[PDB]
């Protein structure tokens, strides 16, 4: 028995949160002898080259960047990279000491795409201003993530991805002051480094950059508080200064001139900000607990230009700070670095289709 309008039977997709070993894809070159290219070639796949996603209309999905097993896997890969790449001269770990050759090697991060294998898929939030924990009402499916450079560093997030609208801040718990505040900029700020032991940053641009962040923070902590930035409260050299790699050498830059501002406190300058920097042969490990010593720098000319696309902050707070909040540079857990890129993704398991009911 039929009537007028042709009834349609739909085969609706069905998936479920899951975990599996993903593979990766890169534009690595088999003729480049730099470590990232060498590693990527040995463990990755050629690229896209015209990526497309399957938008899923009127679908809502819940995410949780702070519990994304994609991060744990990427972390292990970047660790596994440094193991065969940056060979230190000395390795101190657990009452144990090791000595080995330590050849200087070209070292520049190359974008990596993490892809779902046969049977799985990766949901992706298309909502531009998304905090990373909660419902996304604009998801879609992808084969592979975007280009993610394994930039290891603290305080400032380099060569990353900008927010598509306004400055975004993300935290597993804004209330808990022990928790990092991953920040995403909508406009990159160039930091030009040199082996001469300093780093340049446009003063006026970085000034506005802070006003944006400040306004986003003042919004999160009640529209009435004064936002102040201060220098690292102390810790290891890799935390207290803007620690970062640049051409095989580890740089430790003083960042106090960056974070000495006071905002929303209603009561001559320098052309650009110059940061005191210094390479170090003896560094703390980020992989695990321990130290490592490296060989002396090669040539004097060491230039590295990068884009500041993000920040790792921490708040002070306490049962005393009323009418104002204090924020200092931070970081250290390289997973936050990963989560600043893998925040909109989520790997899912695909299973048999389900048919749709009829209501009106």
């Amino acid at each position, epitope marked *: 028995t039929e009537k007028l309008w042709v009834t349609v039977y739909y085969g609706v997709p069905v998936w479920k949160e899951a975990t599996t070993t993903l593979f990766c894809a890169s534009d690595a070159k088999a003729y480049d002898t730099e470590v990232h290219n060498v590693w990527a070639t040995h463990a990755c796949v050629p690229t896209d080259p015209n990526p497309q996603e399957v938008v899923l209309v009127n679908v809502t999905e819940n995410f949780n960047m702070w519990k994304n097993d994609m991060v744990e896997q990427m972390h292990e890969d970047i660790i596994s990279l440094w193991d065969q790449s940056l060979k230190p*001269c*000395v390795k101190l770990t657990g009452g144990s*000491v090791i*000595t*080995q*050759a*330590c*050849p*200087k090697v070209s070292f520049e991060p190359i974008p990596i795409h993490y892809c779902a294998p046969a049977g799985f898929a990766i949901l992706k939030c298309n909502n531009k201003t998304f905090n990373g924990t909660g419902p996304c009402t604009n998801v879609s499916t992808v084969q592979c993530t975007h280009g993610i450079r394994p930039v290891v560093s603290s305080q400032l997030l380099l060569n990353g991805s900008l927010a598509e609208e306004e400055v975004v801040i993300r935290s597993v718990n804004f209330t808990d002051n022990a928790k990092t505040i991953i920040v995403q900029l909508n406009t990159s700020v160039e930091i030009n480094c040199t082996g001469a032991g300093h780093c340049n940053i446009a003063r006026a641009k970085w000034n506005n950059t802070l006003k944006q962040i400040a306004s986003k923070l003042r919004e999160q902590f009640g529209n009435n508080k004064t936002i102040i930035f201060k220098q690292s409260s102390g810790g290891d*050299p890799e935390i207290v200064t803007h620690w970062f790699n640049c051409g095989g050498e580890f740089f430790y830059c003083n960042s106090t001139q960056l974070f000495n501002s006071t905002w929303f406190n209603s009561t001559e300058g320098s052309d650009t900000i110059t940061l005191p920097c210094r390479i*170090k*042969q*003896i560094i703390n490990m980020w992989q695990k607990v321990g*130290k490592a*010593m*490296y*060989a*002396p720098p090669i040539s004097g000319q060491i230039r590295c230009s990068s884009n500041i696309t993000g920040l790792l902050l921490t708040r002070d707070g306490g049962n005393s700070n009323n009418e104002s909040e204090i924020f200092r540079p931070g970081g250290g857990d390289m997973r936050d670095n990963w989560r600043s890129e893998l925040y909109k993704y989520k790997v899912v398991k695909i299973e048999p289709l389900g048919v749709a009911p009829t209501k009106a």
Partner: antibody
Amino acid sequence: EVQLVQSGAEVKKPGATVKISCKASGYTFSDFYMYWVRQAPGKGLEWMGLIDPEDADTMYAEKFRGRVTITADTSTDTGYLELSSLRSEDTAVYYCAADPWELNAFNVWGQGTLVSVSS
Amino acid sequence: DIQMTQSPSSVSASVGDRVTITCRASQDISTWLAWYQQKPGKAPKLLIYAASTLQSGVPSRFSGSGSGTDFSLTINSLQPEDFATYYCQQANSFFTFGGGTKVEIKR
């Protein structure tokens, strides 16, 4: 101009703990590593350790780990060196060196500090 | 640690003679080596750094070569004030010294 002026000779009994100094001048003290070397009577040179005064990062030779300690009072431009559980074979001259020109070798040296350890 | 082994332990030579002493690391250390001279009763004197680079104010007849593990210090026209004990030294991280090589006079 540049110089490293150590302390005077010292006599100790086995089991004691000596701590000599090395006041430095002629350059920015806290910007450069400092190294310690000892030389037994009529025997070859023997490195002991180093230190970056800024972060107090230290390194020791295997023959001294967990028995030697190198520090550096940045305010007085002075470096020290401690040796716990002294023995009879620790009798030697102790030099301190530095490299204010960063050639990765010992350019400047101290006059030496004779440490005699016996019963 | 990494071992520095230099030989011979002793070598006798006349003036004007040319002498070669060699060093050898148990593990690759690139060009990070240093040579010292030391006369009895005084502190060592830097001769060569970076394995080949001559220290300022040092006679041109001094020169070292090698890279990686095998190194060598060489004096051309041997002089009266060149008779002493010479040491090599790892300089990339640790600073282990070689056994030592005494260059005494021949008669």
